[PDB]
Design a binder for this molecule. Structure first.
Ligand code: NI
Ligand code: NI
Ligand code: NI
Length: 160
């Protein structure tokens, strides 16, 4: 169980380093992944990026039992499948107490590596697509407030 960094912390602004291929399949990468699951799960989040716990790596996890498969994604690359955008409510453990509506691509392809270096290549839409965009934003130093285009839909969760 690891401390989730909060918006304002300069570490969330980094462009994360790729996971080195030497670390694929290692116990250390395993431990990091397990800590991330334990951390995400303890605070009840749908996703977590390694930078939010202060680890400078292109690694994210996400899962929701609109269900989304439990996934561990390294060194990702996202490709929008079209121009259709869709607004949805988002929150984030690094921005506690808030929700905001954010416009994302409705459908994406994502690629990357699983923790053993096996290739991942999925096309997905709706919520799954949103989660993946949201978590990969952490790897380029972006939190969702920086993606809001309608500020009337940004506020405290209990107020909204
Ligand atoms: Ni290398
Ligand atoms: Ni539990
Ligand atoms: Ni987040």
């Amino acid at each position: 169980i690891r401390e989730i960094l909060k918006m304002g912390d300069e570490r969330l602004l980094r462009i994360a380093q790729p996971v080195p291929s030497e670390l694929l399949g290692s116990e250390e990468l395993q431990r990091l992944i397990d800590d991330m699951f334990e951390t995400m799960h303890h605070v009840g989040g749908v996703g977590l990026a390694a930078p939010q716990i202060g680890v400078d790596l292109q690694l994210v996890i996400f899962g929701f039992e609109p269900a989304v498969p439990p996934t561990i994604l390294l060194n990702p690359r996202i490709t929008p499948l079209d121009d259709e955008m869709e607004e949805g409510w988002e929150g984030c453990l690094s921005v506690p107490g808030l929700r905001g509506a954010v416009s994302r691509h409705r459908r994406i392809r994502y690629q990357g590596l699983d923790p053993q270096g096996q290739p991942i290549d999925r096309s997905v839409e709706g919520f799954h697509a949103r989660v993946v965009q949201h978590e990969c934003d952490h790897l380029i130093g972006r939190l969702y407030p920086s993606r809001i285009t309608d500020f009337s839909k940004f506020g405290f969760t209990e107020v909204l």
